[PDB]
């Protein structure tokens, strides 16, 4: 029984070994604690929006959507239908990006490293859509608490359709590399098994629930934008091991493709932000020709909108699990409190139980199957 | 609705057992993976020959900042300080005073590009299209000091990139 | 893709699927980089009457 320190996302891990086995695993976090929640209290809501891109920097628009939904609930407004459809479209695109990241980096840590490039080409393509729609590849800040910042450029939907019609064979090549491979199975099968009761008690969410046979999904049970107007299936695991969660994430990629097709077909016309110039800024032409519009633009970009007092907890089904925000407003344009709940915190808390009586090399597999990004863990 | 990913029961007849035994003993799935990799070897790579080819961009792309001016040649900035107030990172510092002709103009306009997060809030809070975040992205520096822009640097950037800045604003201003 | 027929046959047999149908490199089939101007319709509260703000 020797204690060894795997030091410098970036993680420090203190583990005691009895030979090959692991006896106690202790993750030491805080190497990426920037103090985001305290810095939010010194900003307005619009100024506090870009922090959420950096929270979970693999699934940006999902954090944007969760923050926007919380602020909408506190403001007592609702976005226009086209804004909601665009939000769900880009949320599914973001889910595809996150699942590519998770699976490819998991396999890379295992030692495969070829699907990483195969799928990072598609990640680059998806990046172009983000760049085209907003002007930034990763931290777009596109989804706003009133809707979306701007409308789609005239050629975006055709390119999204052309990209999404060839993605299935990319997933298929990934599955050829990984799904039926015996080395991959021996690396992932029967590793990190967690029971349904223990997964539920420990605060797990997302695949960590679904992999254990629990039939739960926030997009189905508690739909938020237009997710009740689209049809998709929810893959459910049977053994609660790493292999089942890998299969679940791949099937989520396929279901995200299905939802993307539906969202492309049913995109409605109309405006993109709530037509209430005391929350969403007016158009540049209106600001430059009208007096109320200029006053409202000035006040919104200097002071911001005042949110009625109250506290909410708004959660969404982010690609990593339940991502929530507990937002407390004292009645001003500056949030009084913003607690950020990320599934990675609970997953890394459960890491210690998840790695009982396993090899040293299996800890890497467990960390990979939890898909821990330390920006959301440390905040 | 929901799906099952791994509740497939393998057949226990002699043919399926023999197929599984042949798979174990002759490594069929490993050779299948080898075939997939071999197939991927014989197709064209996705690499572009930088710096001769450049990755695609859009008029909405936001890179290095610039301060623009009117066609007469007189700077658009009126020291309203809305870009300074909206800046999430507090990366803009502005000081103003009446000019010799009484114009409302800035005597100091600094952007700390090491504090900037390139969100574009400044260029959308500007009522006169004075501050823009242009399409340049190749401005890496050998020292920290040269990434601290002042009014002269931003004005030079505007004069340098005005052609395609105006082209991009023309292409994208109907969505704003 | 400007690949010879023999190389296409070899890659298709090795992968087991028809690669030329759905290529992962983008070609002239994408949308043009210069587009017509848009119009972007107005919202529902852009009325000139019966549009008092206290009601919305």
């Amino acid at each position: 029984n020797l204690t060894l320190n795997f030091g410098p996302g970036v993680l420090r891990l203190v583990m005691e070994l009895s030979g090959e086995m692991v006896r106690k695993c202790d993750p030491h976090i805080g190497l990426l604690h920037r103090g985001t929640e305290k810095l939010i209290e010194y900003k307005t809501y619009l100024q506090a929006l870009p922090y959420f891109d950096r929270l979970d920097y693999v699934s940006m628009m999902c954090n944007e959507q969760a923050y926007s939904l919380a602020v909408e609930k506190l403001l007592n407004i609702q976005p226009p239908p086209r804004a909601q459809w665009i939000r769900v479209l880009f949320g599914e695109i973001t889910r595809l990006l996150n699942h590519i990241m998770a699976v490819t980096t998991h396999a890379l840590d295992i030692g495969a490293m070829t699907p990483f490039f195969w799928m990072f080409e598609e990640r680059e393509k998806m990046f172009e859509f983000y760049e085209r729609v907003s002007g930034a590849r990763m931290h777009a800040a596109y989804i706003r608490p009133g809707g979306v910042h701007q409308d789609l450029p005239l050629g975006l939907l055709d390119d999204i359709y052309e990209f999404s019609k060839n993605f299935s064979f990319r997933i298929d090549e990934l599955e050829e590399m990984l799904t039926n491979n015996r080395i991959w199975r021996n690396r992932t099968v029967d590793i990190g098994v967690v029971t349904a009761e223990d997964a539920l008690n420990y605060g797990f969410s997302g695949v960590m629930l679904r992999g254990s046979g629990i039939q739960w999904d926030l997009r189905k049970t508690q739909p938020y934008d237009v997710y009740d107007q689209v049809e998709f299936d929810v893959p459910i695991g049977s053994r609660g091991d790493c292999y089942d969660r890998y299969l679940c994430r791949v099937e989520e990629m396929r279901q995200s493709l299905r939802i993307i097709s539906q969202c492309l077909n049913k995109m409605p016309p109309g405006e993109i932000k709530v037509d209430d110039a005391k929350v969403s800024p007016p158009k540049r032409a209106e600001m430059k020709t009208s007096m109320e519009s200029l006053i409202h633009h000035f006040k919104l970009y200097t002071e911001g909108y005042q949110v009625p007092p109250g506290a909410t907890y708004t959660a969404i089904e982010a690609p990593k699990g339940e991502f929530g925000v507990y937002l407390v407003s004292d009645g001003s344009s500056r949030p009084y409190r913003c607690k950020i709940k990320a599934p990675g915190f609970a997953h890394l808390a459960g890491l210690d139980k998840m790695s009982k009586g396993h090899m040293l090399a299996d800890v890497v597999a467990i960390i990979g199957t939890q898909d821990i990004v330390f920006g959301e863990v440390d905040r | 609705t929901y799906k099952f990913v791994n509740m497939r029961e393998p057949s226990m007849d002699m043919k399926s057992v023999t197929d599984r035994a042949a798979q174990t003993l002759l490594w069929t799935e490993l050779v299948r993976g080898l075939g997939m990799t071999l197939s991927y070897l014989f197709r064209e790579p996705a690499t572009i020959n930088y710096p001769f080819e450049k990755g695609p961009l859009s008029p909405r792309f936001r890179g290095e900042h610039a301060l623009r001016r009117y066609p007469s040649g007189e700077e658009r900035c009126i020291a309203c300080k809305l870009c300074e107030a909206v800046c999430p990172a507090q990366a803009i510092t502005i000081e103003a005073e009446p000019r010799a002709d009484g114009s409302r103009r800035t005597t100091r306009y600094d952007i700390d590009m090491t504090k900037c997060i390139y969100c574009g809030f400044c260029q959308e809070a500007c009522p006169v299209d004075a501050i823009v975040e242009g399409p340049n992205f190749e401005f890496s520096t050998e020292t920290h000091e040269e990434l601290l822009y002042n009014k002269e640097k931003l004005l030079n950037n505007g004069d340098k990139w005005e052609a395609e800045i105006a082209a991009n604003i023309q292409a994208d201003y109907l969505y704003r | 893709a400007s690949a010879t027929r023999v190389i296409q046959l070899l890659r298709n047999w090795a992968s087991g699927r028809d690669l030329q149908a759905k290529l992962q490199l983008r070609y002239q089939e994408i949308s043009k980089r210069t587009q017509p101007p848009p119009k972007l319709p107005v919202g529902p509260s852009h009325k000139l009457s019966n549009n008092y703000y206290c009601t919305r």
């Binding site: 409308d151 299935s168 599955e175 050829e176 396929r254 | 299948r32 | 119009k39």
Partner: peptide
């Protein structure tokens, strides 16, 4: 005057998109 023009799906929608897993069998006992 001008009529509304924004990004919309074409008339009749887009073509079907394949999403099911496609793992063929080469075939040998």
């Amino acid at each position: 005057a001008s009529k509304v023009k924004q990004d919309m799906p074409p008339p009749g929608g887009y073509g079907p998109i394949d999403y099911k897993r496609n793992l063929p069998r080469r075939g040998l006992s």
